[PDB]
Ligand binder design. Sequence first.
Ligand code: NAG
Length: 153
Amino acid sequence: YLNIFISHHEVMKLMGLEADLFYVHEGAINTYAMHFTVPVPADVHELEFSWQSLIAYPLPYAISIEYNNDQEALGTPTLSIPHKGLVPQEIESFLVYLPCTGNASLQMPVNVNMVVRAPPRFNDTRLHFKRNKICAKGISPEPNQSPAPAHAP
Ligand SMILES: *[C@@H]1O[C@H](CO)[C@@H](O)[C@H](O)[C@H]1NC(C)=O
């Protein structure tokens, strides 16, 4: 009833291979793949997840993040979607932003927790995505709002 996967482009960005990876396929969790800790290079500033509900019954989701607050190398992770809502019935993708400050070099765990509530005939999908974020000094995401020369009137 539920697909959760990372696309070909996401696997190429993260790992350099041409493949996709379904972490959940029609409700079945890829427990083997969930064991792995995926490294996130210094120059990768976001993780992209893709998902799709395969039924009409509403699928509530909840997303939480695990990371050490108390350091100077990684800024606060954010989402491109609300941390709670419904899983879409068309394939959609969302981002977990992992913005390294560029003011420090460091490796650290960042884990993404997801819970998708199931209709009563199935069991909830509980996921613990393990990632190890690399940060490097002088490597940080660029802003997309561009500067403009300014002077006083
Ligand atoms: C953000 O978009 C701007 C376009 O103004 C571009 O200069 C920059 O390279 C982009 N950076 C990222 C991380 O998307």
